[PDB]
Each structure stands twice: as structure tokens, then as C-alpha cells.
Design a protein around this ligand. Structure first.
Ligand SMILES: O=C1C[C@@H](c2ccc(O)cc2)Oc2cc(O)cc(O)c21
Length: 214
């Protein structure tokens, strides 16, 4: 109560300002966070909160052309978010579930979105089909009540690690690993790309990276 403390919240939901993945001494900083909102029968429902993490100095070193751009200029530029999705650096997304769902509901819905988005880009082949089956089957085994957490980890752009946490803590190891460049990138693109499910997360990340680069 006597020294400065930093708190980050997304509509009241706390996010850690930094996360150090188990097995690593490298700290990932929260770049930005937002919500997945869905308008259902005119009701604006917040169903998850999404936080995006990376090593600040490292990711800045891979985004140098954007230096000096304001958050507004970045948020309006699809090229910026494509650079961010492709940057060859470690990334972590933390999802806090707001509206409880079955794992099979989550996995099925997101898998179909990635299937469709990859198909739209002509990046859907048998390899991606198989990887998406692995993704879906992982979630079929899980329950996602309010307050549960999904961790998506990209130790490199082509590798996706997944865990589900009941208490927000990171497990000592990933529960599932999906090795497919297109699926790994497409999942990150669900959050940061065009027709993103979370414009708020994108805007927040634009604010964070704009500040970081300055
Ligand atoms: O209703 C949905 C939609 C679902 C979803 C995921 C991916 C996709 O492509 C479409 C929908 O995400 C959610 C996540 C929740 O915690 C609660 C929810 O009710 C939902």
C-alpha cells in the first residue's frame, strides 16, 4: 500500500503486466489487451478478454519502420498488423473466458473460422486440415467456465502451443503443440488481422507498440 504498483484491467478484468513463461528467464510484456464482443440479437455481449504479450525490446527491434507512428496511424494500417503477425519473435496470447462455454464449442467455432480464413487465402491444404483436427480435438477434452484461461504460445511463428488453466497460472509445459505455419499464423491473425474478432485488442496493441517504438 506504500510503493507504486502497476495494474492493467480490461473492463475490470485484471491482466498481469508481464508474464514469464516457465522454463524461461525472459519476461514478456503485455503489449495490449481488449475484448471479444459479439452482438447477439442486438445485445452487446463480452465473451472473452484477450491479452497479447511479447518481449518489448525484441519485438520493437523487428518493427523499426513503424517508429514514430501514432496509435491512430498504426491501427488503420493492415500492413502494420501483418508485420506484427509475421515478426519472428516469441508471442503469447492470454484469453480470460467471460462467458462460460464447452471446450468443444470454442474449439469447433474457432477451428471453422481458421478453416474458412485459410481457404479464403488459398492456404488450406491437407496439412492444415490435419492440424485443425488436432486443434479441435484438444478443446473437445476441455471445459471453459467463466474465469478459465486459454494460453496460446508461439515460440516461433510456425509452432502453436496451447494450454487451458483453471487458476490463470502457466503450466510447466504446453498441453498441446500444433506444428503448422499456416494454422499458427491464422490463429494469431484471428485476433490481429483483418476482420479481427477484437478491434479493441488491436487498438490497444497499436497504443502499446506506438509508445514502445517512441
Ligand atoms: O459464442 C461464442 C462464440 C465463440 C466463437 C469463437 C470463434 C469463432 O470463429 C466464432 C465464435 O467464442 C466464445 C467464447 C466464449 O467464452 C463464449 C461464447 O459464447 C463464445
Amino acid at each position: 500500500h506504500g510503493m507504486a504498483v502497476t495494474k492493467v484491467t480490461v473492463d475490470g478484468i485484471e491482466f498481469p503486466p508481464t508474464i514469464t513463461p516457465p522454463g524461461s528467464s525472459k519476461s514478456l510484456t503485455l503489449l495490449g489487451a481488449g475484448v471479444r464482443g459479439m452482438e447477439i440479437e442486438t445485445i452487446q455481449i463480452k465473451v472473452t478478454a484477450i491479452g497479447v504479450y511479447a518481449e518489448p525490446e525484441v519485438i520493437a527491434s523487428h518493427l523499426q519502420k513503424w517508429k514514430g507512428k501514432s496509435a491512430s496511424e498504426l491501427v488503420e494500417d493492415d500492413g502494420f498488423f501483418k508485420d506484427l503477425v509475421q515478426a519472428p519473435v516469441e508471442k503469447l496470447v492470454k484469453i480470460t473466458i467471460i462467458k462460460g462455454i464447452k471446450g468443444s464449442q470454442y474449439g469447433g467455432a474457432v477451428e471453422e473460422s481458421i478453416r474458412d480464413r485459410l481457404a479464403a487465402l488459398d492456404k488450406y491444404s491437407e496439412a492444415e486440415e490435419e492440424a485443425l483436427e488436432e486443434f479441435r480435438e484438444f478443446f473437445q477434452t476441455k471445459s471453459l467456465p467463466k474465469g478459465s484461461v486459454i494460453f496460446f504460445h508461439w515460440p516461433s511463428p510456425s509452432t502453436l502451443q496451447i494450454s487451458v488453466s483453471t487458476d490463470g497460472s502457466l503450466p510447466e509445459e504446453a498441453e498441446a503443440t500444433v506444428e503448422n505455419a499456416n494454422v499458427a499464423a491464422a490463429l494469431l491473425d484471428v485476433f490481429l488481422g483483418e476482420n479481427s474478432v477484437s478491434p479493441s485488442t488491436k487498438a490497444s496493441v497499436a497504443e502499446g507498440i506506438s509508445a514502445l517504438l517512441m
